[PDB]
RNA sequence: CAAGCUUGAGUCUCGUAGAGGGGGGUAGAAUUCCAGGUGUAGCGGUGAAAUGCGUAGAGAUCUGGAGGAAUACCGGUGGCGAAGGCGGCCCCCUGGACGAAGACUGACGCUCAGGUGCGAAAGCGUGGGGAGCAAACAGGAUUAGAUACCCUGGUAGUCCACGCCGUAAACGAUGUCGACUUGGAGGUUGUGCCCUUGAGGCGUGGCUUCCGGAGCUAACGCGUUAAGUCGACCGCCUGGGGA
RNA sequence: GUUUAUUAAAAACACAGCACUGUGCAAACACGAAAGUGGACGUAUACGGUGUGACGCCUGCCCGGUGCCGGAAGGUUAAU
């Protein structure tokens, strides 16, 4: 279900500064945190999410 | 015959040419016995960071059963074509005939 | 493939030859051959102007096409031939209108391969097209300098110019020496490296093998008497000069380019 | 893998006897049942049953006295590594009387004592105490 | 690997039916097919060691099955190595 | 770790928010860390040492 | 020796997770250098200094360019791999593991001297590459001395291709396979039943972390993933130095 | 292999290989007051110069002196 196009949802699981957030904090199951981080890492390629907050 | 999913994005001054590119590529897939399970066109959207100096560019989704033979003609044309700045082909384990979250939200 | 020949005589011990099975066996294509008679390094005054050249084996001249000026018409590679005038191997090509020509064989090019010139042509090795129509990044060879003159840069075995920049009428080339250089961008260049890149790995193994390539012995200045060379005399083995050419100019260090008209095109001299 | 299944039965007793189990099961065989019988006639175990047609299951019922085991100790003797046969004069006796060897003779499995009366020897399977 | 299309083809030939998937002749045949497909992978990819460990398991497993198949019945054994091309 | 001062705010609240935005990012943790090369054997050891300790 | 059987061992069907391996592309951050613009007297470095760079304009700052290497966050007594090991994203080729229900072969098994393969780092060979780091080497400090620790530089090397080398505290200092023997807390990955009514209630596989019982052990400890109770095969030890 | 035809055949010269350095093509360099020619109908895996001399193991310290290379602020300096 979790999906690199869905940049609404992916914003809950990054910072102000566009760092991926750890499962520790968010409470998320670790299967899905793998899928999340992979989603986010594609999103950043396509320029839908940012790497940083310099721009 | 495997399923793929092809986001590319396009130099915004050649938003002119976009439907002309689509109709070549979409034809050339069905030319070799393919499908096209959907196609969207999210239009001009703001980039999260500059690429080639460009703020803004013209995105295009496309989901596609095809062979590997046609997908390389498609990957090569993207590389040689200057108007297309950035490009992705993922693989996928089913088809996806649907709208995305990008079209639905509006 | 390189081949360490087994040491049955003392002159075979160190030989390493560059066998290519893919080359043609049998006589080369007749219309494209010329007479090409040797000079022994001597000029129209009979004087040796270039030392150490002389003798060797007879050689016909293969008329290669460095211009590649026959446009839009596809061409198939018939075979790869040996060429004695040249580190590169060459390829006989048959055009769709029944013309034949020789061309330099790029790396990765065998029988059956279509290759095409001019502006339409696809960006794949073998194919020649003006450097406006090539992607920056690309790796090319047999590059012109003035438009229409013919290929001059990157013709030896295993060589490639590499295109680093566009800027208007001109483009910039990292040449193989390490020398960045502007060339105006209507100039053609074939794509690929040049073939036969194992050519450097060969070892001649004996004196005579050098003589077969037309290359006479070389006598050290320090052997000679003072009248013959600056390095001259000595009882025993002396030196005590600074190294110099036979005509007394410093070697080891001293730069010898004075050519002011070509300076503007040189972005950066070699490393 | 599973290369001496008699030793397996003997271990399953010993380990159940240590863990204070009322009963233990294993895969059956003919020879296990033969031994199981000798062990019962001599009073180290209460009773055995066999259930199943296709994959039969020997269930021994173990025996205790003063809240404490009856089978004080139980060695294998003849292994697959090292088969141990004995002539009738050379038969061992175990705690100088008080335990029992178990011998396969040509007239079936029996005690050490009952092979001396019958006047036989053979493969010595196991001591018990 | 093989596909299912290619697999079913092999059970067909060497078996009795499509539900005799695990007879000794079929197992050998599947392995032999599976080995020869891989000979192309390892032509191109010589430094792939971790996959070749897998290949060598097929080879050894085949050779165990054929040694069984001699102790059972040499009619089936001699038929099978001709049909498949083994032993050389 | 970017911040502005919006209007009718003190200076001293913005300088506080700067620091609670930077300790939230771990800029300085992520810079102490790359002062010196740590061999991977040492990285794994310190990781273990923390995990075993934090059983308390 | 002959004929069987299906529980050990395998084959097929369908799914799930995974830094498993090989090849090919590609992204962004940062260091270095190169060419510019603004700008002026310091910078850098340390315990403190000096060597070093700087009025020939450094450091700081902005723009553009080159190139190489490594992949922040995620990331976890998390995972995969026989071991060595494996970490951005995408594609192509490919190995294994596990689970569910059924079908199939019918002991086809376990272990393995000699043999063959795999095997970190350093190192060697041929050819490329070379940003950063950095054995050797140089200068500066410190010191009784300082052939070192610290500082400024810096070459092999580190990187790629194809060959060799065959070793490590290559360690869980615990050979492989199988069986049995009280518990508790977790993690990870499957799967089946349940006003799914909740991120849940009841079970059932696989891998894994920490406690600890009987027992074992010289003791420390190990403790169902044994160093407990057994069996099969292999490797190895027999005082310290010499070695 | 070569060498002092006519007192020296050698440990001398050459050599395959190694290294440094120059040279971007109207190449460096050489012969020519010049035109021009060789280099080469080659193009940096190519060409010229210098030293060493198969192969194996190696190839340490010194940039004060003399050359060469780079640097431009300042000094000194010609014709004009």
């Amino acid at each position: 279900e979790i999906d690199y196009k869905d940049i609404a949802t992916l914003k809950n699981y990054i910072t102000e500064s566009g760092k991926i957030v750890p499962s520790r904090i968010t409470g998320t199951r670790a299967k899905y945190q793998r899928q999340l981080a992979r989603a986010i890492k594609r999103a950043r390629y396509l320029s839908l999410l940012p790497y940083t907050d310099r721009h | 015959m495997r399923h793929y999913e092809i986001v590319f994005m396009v130099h915004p001054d050649q938003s002119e040419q976009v439907p002309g590119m689509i109709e070549r590529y979409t034809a050339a897939i069905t030319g070799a016995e393919g499908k096209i399970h959907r196609l969207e066109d999210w239009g001009r959207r703001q980039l999260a960071y500059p690429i080639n100096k460009l703020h803004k560019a013209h995105y295009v989704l496309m989901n596609v059963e095809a062979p590997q033979e046609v997908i390389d003609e498609l990957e090569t044309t993207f590389r040689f074509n200057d108007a297309v700045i950035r490009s992705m082909v993922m693989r996928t384990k089913h088809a996806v005939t649907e709208a995305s979250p990008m079209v639905k939200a509006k | 493939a390189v081949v360490k020949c087994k040491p049955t005589s003392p002159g075979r011990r160190h030989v390493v030859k560059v066998v290519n099975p893919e080359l043609h066996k049998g006589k080369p294509f007749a219309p494209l051959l010329e007479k090409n008679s040797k000079s022994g390094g001597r000029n129209n005054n009979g004087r040796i102007t270039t030392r150490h050249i002389g003798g060797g084996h007879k050689q016909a001249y293969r008329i290669v096409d460095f211009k590649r000026n026959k446009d839009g018409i596809p061409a198939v590679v018939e075979r790869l031939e040996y060429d004695p005038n040249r580190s590169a191997n060459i390829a006989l090509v048959l055009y769709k209108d029944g013309e034949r020509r020789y061309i330099l064989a790029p790396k990765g090019l065998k029988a059956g391969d279509q290759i095409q010139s001019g502006v339409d042509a696809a960006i794949k090795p073998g194919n020649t097209l003006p450097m406006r129509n090539i992607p920056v990044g690309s790796t090319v060879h047999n590059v012109e300098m003035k438009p229409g003159k013919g290929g001059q840069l990157a013709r030896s075995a295993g060589t490639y110019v590499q295109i680093v920049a566009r800027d208007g009428a001109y483009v910039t080339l990292r040449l193989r020496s390490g020398e960045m250089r502007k060339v105006e961008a209507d100039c053609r260049a074939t794509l690929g490296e040049v073939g036969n890149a194992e050519h450097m790995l060969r070892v001649l193994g004996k004196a005579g093998a050098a003589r077969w390539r037309g290359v006479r012995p070389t006598v050290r200045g320090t052997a000679m008497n003072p009248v013959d060379h600056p390095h001259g005399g000595g009882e025993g083995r002396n030196f005590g000069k600074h190294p110099v050419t036979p005509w007394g100019v410093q070697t080891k260090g001293k730069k010898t380019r004075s050519n002011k008209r070509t300076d503007k095109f040189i972005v950066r001299r070699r490393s | 893998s599973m290369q001496d299944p008699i030793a397996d039965m003997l271990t399953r007793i010993r380990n159940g006897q240590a863990a204070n189990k009322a009963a233990v099961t294993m895969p059956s065989s003919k020879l296990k049942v033969a031994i199981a019988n000798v062990l019962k006639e001599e009073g180290f175990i209460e009773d055995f049953k066999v259930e199943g047609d296709t994959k039969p299951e020997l269930e021994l019922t173990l025996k205790y006295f003063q809240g404490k085991a009856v089978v004080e100790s139980i060695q294998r003797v003849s292994r697959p590594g090292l088969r141990i046969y004995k002539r009738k004069d050379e038969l061992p006796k175990v705690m100088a009387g008080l335990g029992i060897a178990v011998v396969s003779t040509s007239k079936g499995v029996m005690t050490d004592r009952a092979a001396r009366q019958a006047g036989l020897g053979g493969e010595i399977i196991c001591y018990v105490a | 690997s093989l596909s299912t299309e290619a697999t079913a083809k092999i059970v067909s030939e060497f078996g009795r039916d499509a539900n005799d998937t695990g007879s000794t002749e079929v197992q050998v045949a599947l392995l032999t097919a599976q080995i020869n497909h891989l000979q192309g992978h390892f032509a191109e990819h010589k430094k792939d060691h971790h996959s070749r460990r897998g290949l060598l398991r097929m080879v050894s497993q085949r050779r165990k099955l054929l040694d069984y198949l001699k102790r059972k019945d040499v009619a089936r054994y001699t038929q099978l190595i001709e049909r498949l091309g083994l032993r050389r | 770790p970017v911040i502005k001062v919006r209007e009718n705010e003190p200076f001293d609240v913005a300088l506080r928010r700067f620091k609670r935005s930077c300790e939230k990012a771990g800029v300085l943790a992520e810079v102490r860390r790359r002062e010196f090369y740590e061999k991977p054997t040492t990285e794994r050891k310190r990781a273990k040492a923390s995990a075993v300790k934090r059983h308390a």
Side-chain angles (χ1 to χ4, degrees):
Chain A
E1 65 182 328
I2 191 64
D3 182 36
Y4 74 93
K5 294 176 286 307
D6 190 19
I7 69 105
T9 302
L10 273 47
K11 279 168 153 49
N12 296 299
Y13 309 113
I14 58 172
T15 61
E16 189 210 90
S17 75
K19 295 184 83 188
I20 302 153
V21 183
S23 157
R24 188 190 290 99
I25 278 54
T26 75
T28 189
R29 297 286 149 282
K31 192 179 170 175
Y32 298 124
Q33 174 84 33
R34 283 197 300 289
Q35 299 186 47
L36 258 160
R38 202 163 33 246
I40 292 156
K41 280 155 144 199
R42 290 180 217 196
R44 294 157 153 180
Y45 185 56
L46 302 176
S47 221
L48 317 184
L49 297 169
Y51 291 110
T52 71
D53 67 334
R54 293 293 305 136
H55 305 108
Chain B
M1 192 167 271
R2 300 155 183 192
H3 306 274
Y4 295 103
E5 170 169 337
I6 303 156
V7 177
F8 65 91
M9 87 196 73
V10 186
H11 190 279
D13 297 43
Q14 290 77 267
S15 298
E16 186 65 18
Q17 300 174 354
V18 167
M21 285 157 48
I22 288 154
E23 290 157 41
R24 278 194 300 286
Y25 303 153
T26 309
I29 292 154
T30 41
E33 308 153 303
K35 291 282 183 283
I36 155 161
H37 301 312
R38 101 249 209 196
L39 189 145
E40 312 207 299
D41 195 313
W42 313 332
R44 293 201 181 192
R45 280 191 65 247
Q46 192 62 90
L47 298 195
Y49 57 97
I51 79 193
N52 314 313
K53 313 303 193 312
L54 303 164
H55 307 261
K56 315 163 179 291
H58 202 118
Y59 295 94
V60 181
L61 190 60
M62 196 189 303
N63 290 249
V64 174
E65 170 169 32
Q68 288 76 283
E69 193 247 56
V70 305
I71 240 77
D72 296 321
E73 287 179 298
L74 195 60
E75 281 178 5
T76 53
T77 185
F78 288 159
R79 185 152 39 206
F80 174 73
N81 195 341
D82 293 314
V84 179
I85 65 195
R86 178 74 64 76
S87 160
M88 204 170 220
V89 333
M90 284 131 298
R91 195 160 150 184
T92 33
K93 73 180 195 289
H94 288 101
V96 271
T97 309
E98 207 161 295
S100 87
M102 305 267 77
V103 176
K104 278 171 175 140
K106 305 192 154 191
Chain C
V2 306
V3 182
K4 293 219 158 163
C5 276
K6 296 183 146 192
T8 58
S9 28
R12 296 296 291 191
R13 188 178 282 288
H14 297 300
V15 169
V16 171
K17 61 197 191 204
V18 161
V19 174
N20 200 339
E22 211 162 46
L23 253 39
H24 190 46
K25 292 167 200 210
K27 295 274 182 264
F29 187 65
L32 307 176
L33 296 184
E34 289 181 325
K35 190 172 114 59
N36 186 34
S37 57
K38 303 199 288 201
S39 60
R42 289 134 154 105
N43 74 327
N44 68 357
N45 308 333
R47 301 293 192 71
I48 295 154
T49 69
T50 314
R51 307 183 313 159
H52 317 150
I53 302 148
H57 202 292
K58 200 112 146 282
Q59 310 178 323
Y61 185 70
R62 319 295 189 276
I63 299 153
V64 174
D65 196 14
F66 292 109
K67 296 201 143 187
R68 300 287 307 278
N69 62 82
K70 182 197 183 62
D71 260 35
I73 293 162
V76 73
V77 169
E78 295 189 289
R79 65 218 184 192
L80 311 183
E81 300 213 334
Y82 188 69
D83 185 24
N85 306 286
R86 217 157 254 118
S87 17
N89 295 300
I90 58 173
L92 194 41
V93 304
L94 178 69
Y95 288 95
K96 277 277 203 206
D97 49 51
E99 179 153 35
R100 281 177 189 75
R101 295 183 171 177
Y102 284 122
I103 53 146
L104 301 192
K107 190 224 164 156
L109 181 119
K110 55 260 165 128
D113 297 29
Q114 282 265 300
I115 55 106
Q116 194 161 35
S117 51
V119 182
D120 66 302
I123 309 316
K124 41 152 283 201
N127 292 30
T128 309
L129 44 131
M131 282 186 289
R132 72 185 175 260
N133 303 308
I134 306 172
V136 163
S138 288
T139 276
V140 296
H141 71 97
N142 188 53
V143 186
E144 307 197 316
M145 282 170 58
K146 299 185 194 303
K149 182 189 196 151
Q152 291 177 307
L153 310 155
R155 305 173 166 189
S156 181
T159 55
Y160 54 103
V161 165
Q162 192 224 316
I163 298 178
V164 305
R166 196 96 76 258
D167 186 33
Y170 307 69
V171 303
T172 302
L173 300 176
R174 189 171 294 119
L175 302 178
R176 182 74 186 137
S177 67
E179 166 148 321
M180 298 278 248
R181 196 229 160 74
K182 294 179 196 297
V183 171
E184 68 177 320
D186 303 312
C187 292
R188 313 309 218 72
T190 317
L191 263 101
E193 300 179 344
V194 180
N196 197 41
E198 64 175 285
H199 169 91
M200 79 205 317
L201 279 9
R202 85 196 186 183
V203 174
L204 302 178
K206 44 179 235 178
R211 309 304 304 281
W212 303 335
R213 306 171 150 71
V215 179
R216 304 200 66 227
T218 301
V219 174
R220 295 166 298 120
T222 199
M224 299 178 181
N225 291 306
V227 66
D228 305 312
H229 201 292
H231 289 185
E235 228 69 2
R237 295 211 173 103
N238 313 32
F239 201 91
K241 278 76 188 209
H242 296 116
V244 275
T245 68
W247 311 275
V249 175
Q250 157 87 177
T251 159
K252 278 154 207 304
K254 169 156 264 277
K255 297 222 189 72
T256 78
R257 174 186 173 77
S258 187
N259 183 23
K260 304 195 141 176
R261 69 168 236 290
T262 52
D263 259 64
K264 62 219 180 198
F265 304 133
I266 288 162
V267 171
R268 192 166 60 197
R269 298 287 292 158
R270 84 194 168 266
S271 302
Chain D
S1 55
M2 57 151 141
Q3 295 187 9
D4 196 2
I6 302 305
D8 189 26
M9 165 178 49
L10 297 191
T11 304
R12 286 165 111 105
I13 286 145
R14 195 169 1 160
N15 295 3
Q17 209 74 285
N20 285 261
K21 309 261 265 194
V24 298
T25 62
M26 59 228 73
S28 185
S29 72
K30 277 238 302 319
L31 178 54
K32 289 185 218 185
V33 175
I35 290 152
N37 222 321
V38 168
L39 279 185
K40 190 237 167 134
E41 295 154 45
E42 295 301 309
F44 297 105
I45 70 178
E46 303 284 19
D47 190 46
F48 68 101
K49 294 225 308 318
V50 249
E51 310 94 5
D53 67 322
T54 187
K55 286 151 73 163
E57 203 105 276
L58 187 98
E59 181 235 304
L60 304 147
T61 292
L62 279 53
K63 199 167 151 158
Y64 298 77
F65 192 48
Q66 307 282 237
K68 145 164 265 191
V70 171
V71 180
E72 181 165 20
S73 51
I74 176 156
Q75 295 276 260
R76 198 78 162 96
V77 163
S78 174
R79 329 193 253 88
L82 189 65
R83 300 277 164 189
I84 292 300
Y85 311 101
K86 283 293 207 303
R87 295 204 288 284
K88 69 177 282 184
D89 58 301
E90 303 159 27
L91 284 189
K93 54 168 49 155
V94 167
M95 305 188 148
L98 305 177
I100 51 122
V102 167
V103 190
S104 206
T105 72
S106 303
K107 300 297 190 275
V109 175
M110 57 181 73
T111 53
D112 55 325
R113 295 191 90 187
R116 284 187 209 95
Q117 281 136 47
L120 288 145
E123 194 173 282
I124 297 160
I125 289 159
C126 83
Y127 307 154
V128 196
Chain E
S1 272
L2 282 36
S3 71
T4 33
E5 177 155 30
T7 299
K9 226 157 188 299
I10 290 153
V11 180
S12 145
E13 292 163 53
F14 294 88
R16 299 172 171 183
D17 32 300
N19 288 253
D20 180 48
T21 189
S23 80
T24 303
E25 299 97 322
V26 179
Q27 271 153 322
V28 171
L30 277 156
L31 289 159
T32 312
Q34 185 60 84
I35 286 157
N36 298 333
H37 174 62
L38 285 184
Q39 298 296 350
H41 175 72
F42 292 116
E44 204 177 309
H45 298 314
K46 285 203 274 275
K47 296 300 208 295
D48 190 345
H49 296 306
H50 287 65
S51 305
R52 200 190 302 278
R53 184 136 190 283
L55 172 41
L56 294 170
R57 204 181 139 290
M58 294 150 200
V59 169
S60 107
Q61 199 200 320
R62 183 169 63 176
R63 194 67 210 145
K64 273 150 196 195
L65 287 162
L66 282 154
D67 296 356
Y68 178 64
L69 198 52
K70 264 179 101 173
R71 294 193 284 100
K72 299 295 286 186
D73 186 31
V74 296
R76 285 133 79 202
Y77 174 72
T78 46
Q79 191 161 302
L80 191 63
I81 69 170
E82 290 179 57
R83 193 168 176 192
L84 283 167
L86 310 169
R87 304 301 307 174
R88 302 168 279 282
Chain F
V2 183
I3 260 153
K4 75 195 82 178
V5 189
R6 301 175 307 283
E7 297 172 297
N8 291 300
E9 196 161 22
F11 175 63
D12 204 69
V13 175
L15 185 56
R16 189 149 287 186
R17 273 202 295 114
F18 182 55
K19 289 188 280 142
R20 272 187 299 94
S21 188
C22 288
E23 185 126 45
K24 192 133 192 199
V27 165
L28 299 140
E30 206 72 76
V31 161
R32 276 153 177 174
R33 188 143 86 74
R34 305 162 195 274
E35 208 161 89
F36 296 129
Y37 186 63
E38 197 168 29
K39 293 167 60 186
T41 189
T42 336
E43 291 178 308
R44 272 168 290 171
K45 183 170 66 138
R46 282 204 306 97
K48 270 189 266 278
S50 93
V52 175
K53 268 255 292 314
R54 102 162 52 78
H55 276 203

